[PDB]
Homo-oligomer: A and B are copies of this chain.
């Protein structure tokens, strides 16, 4: 493994991306992948097993955990990464297909599809940011929550596992997503300006 191969793999074979989406976006993507890898198994490993409520009612822990955590942060970020990386994979596959068909026997089409893929990537980033805002208002996570879902009688106190570490990693991931959004907007603006 060399740098001239890793850089080519990350950037794809596309020849229209500038240094914003070729040197900086790949680094932020690697940063997000590494943070998700080092945080998924350890911090969020025992989010449900150590989630306890102050009650004797059977089945209250599971219903309260599902009520307060419809989908954990780790899985939300994994889905966000997959959806954000899908258009880049599509562009790389399209470039490879065009190269194959021209070998066995265009610039504007590649430029347009790259612009469309960057727009879709920005849209996915914004959609996942909005979903995270809807599900979990506020970056901070609290230690104690009040759960009144059936079958729990009245309201019970349930305790979250590692609120502070999860808050730190949430801040990191949200900052990375914001940087990605800014870089995508800058890339779109730069391409439009240079094309005109």
Contacts and interface: CB of A to CB of B under 8 A. Distances in A.
Interface string A123-146: 000000000000000000000000
Interface string A36-71: 000000000000000000001110000000000000
A54 to B, nearest CB: 13
A178 interface: no
A153 interface: yes
Majority DSSP secondary structure for residues of A touching B: loop
Nearest to A55: B58
Contacts of A163: none
Q: Give the interface size class of chain A.
A: under 10
Contacts of A56: 58
A153 B57 CA distance: 11
Contacts of A57: 57-58
Contacts of A153: 151
A148 to B, nearest CB: 16
Contacts of A151: 153
A153 B58 CA distance: 11
A149 to B, nearest CB: 15
A177 to B, nearest CB: 44
A58 B60 CA distance: 13
A59 to B, nearest CB: 9
Interface in A143-196: 151, 153
A75 to B, nearest CB: 31
A56 B57 CA distance: 8
Interface in A82-114: none
Interface of A: 56-58, 151, 153
4 contacts: A56-B58, A57-B57, A57-B58, A151-B153
The 4 closest A-B CB pairs, nearest first, are: A56-B58, A57-B58, A151-B153, A57-B57
